Design a protein around this ligand. Structure first.
Ligand SMILES: COc1cc2nccc(Oc3ccc(NC(=O)c4c(-c5ccncc5)n(C)n(-c5ccccc5)c4=O)nc3)c2cc1OC
Length: 256
């Protein structure tokens, strides 16, 4: 049996593993570039397989500076069945890592945080304009290119999902706005411990804010409140978030 993956690529390292499968770094022999290759074992459930095959087709249609860049997808059935997805190789550190490495307020300068957030929001508004939604927006699903442009993806815990999703109710694109609210807060508010992070984010979910955040960031405090509305209908659209005066003339020393 001839494996397309082993024929066309030189494996470099395993980048990570999940319930779906594995992500490798591998060099394409012909074009000499390094890629991230996600390998999915096709599920035994036929409706889950339907979802996988449909989502790869959807991914292939997507082109945006804030969405991980797609190259190829193929199936292999060795002597059960694997779907390989080839995408642009990003940096090791995702947004969760980035925040974990910047644990002081000095390391979360307003304009820097707003610049990162704006890119995420622009990626989400792109999805919403295409009649798509993310559903699983969280810092660990936010990646950086080698040039630090933020890339929204989905590697595949409940702290970022909308209340309607948690309860297993029907939902709309407004679920992504809820996740955006928590991400904006988390970018602006550094933590020293996981325990502090969990306690504070849980409070913020219920619209209980740390007093120093409300004082230092009145404008983003207002927009986080709006994005975290229990009622999905009263959450703003992503296009309304991106047009907020808060994102007007963002600049910081070292910005491209
Ligand atoms: C150095 O370290 C790393 C560099 C990495 N570089 C690049 C990518 C990396 O990981 C990723 C990131 C993203 C994805 N997939 C998606 O974003 C997918 C997307 C999607 C894209 C954009 N938005 C939402 C979802 N979907 C629709 N499909 C889909 C889902 C179900 C079935 C079929 C296809 C997706 O696979 N895969 C691997 C890395 C991980 C690294 O360390 C672990």
């Amino acid at each position: 049996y001839i494996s397309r993956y082993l024929t066309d690529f030189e494996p470099i390292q395993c980048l990570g593993r999940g319930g779906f499968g594995v992500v490798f770094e591998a060099k394409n022999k012909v074009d000499d570039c390094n890629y991230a290759i996600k390998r999915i074992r096709l599920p035994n459930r036929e409706l889950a397989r339907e979802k996988v095959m449909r989502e790869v087709k959807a991914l292939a249609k997507l082109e945006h500076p804030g969405i991980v860049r797609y190259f190829n997808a193929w199936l292999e059935a060795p002597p059960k069945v694997y779907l390989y997805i080839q995408m642009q190789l990003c940096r090791k550190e995702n947004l969760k890592d980035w925040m974990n490495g910047r644990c002081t307020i000095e390391e979360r300068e307003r304009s820097v945080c707003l610049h990162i957030f704006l890119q995420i929001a622009e990626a989400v508004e792109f999805l919403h304009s295409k009649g798509l939604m993310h559903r699983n927006l969280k810092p660990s699903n936010i990646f950086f290119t080698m040039d630090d442009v933020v890339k929204v993806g989905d590697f595949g815990t409940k702290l970022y999902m909308s209340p309607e999703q948690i309860h297993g109710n029907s939902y709309s694109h407004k679920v992504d706005i809820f996740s955006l609210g928590l991400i904006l807060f988390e970018l602006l508010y550094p933590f020293s411990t996981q325990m502090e992070r969990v306690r504070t984010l849980t409070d913020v979910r219920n619209l209980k804010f740390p007093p120093l955040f409300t004082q230092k960031y009145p404008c983003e405090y207002v927009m986080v409140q709006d994005m975290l509305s229990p009622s999905p209908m009263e959450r703003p659209e992503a296009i309304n978030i991106i047009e907020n005066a808060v994102f007007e003339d963002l600049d910081f020393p070292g910005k491209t």
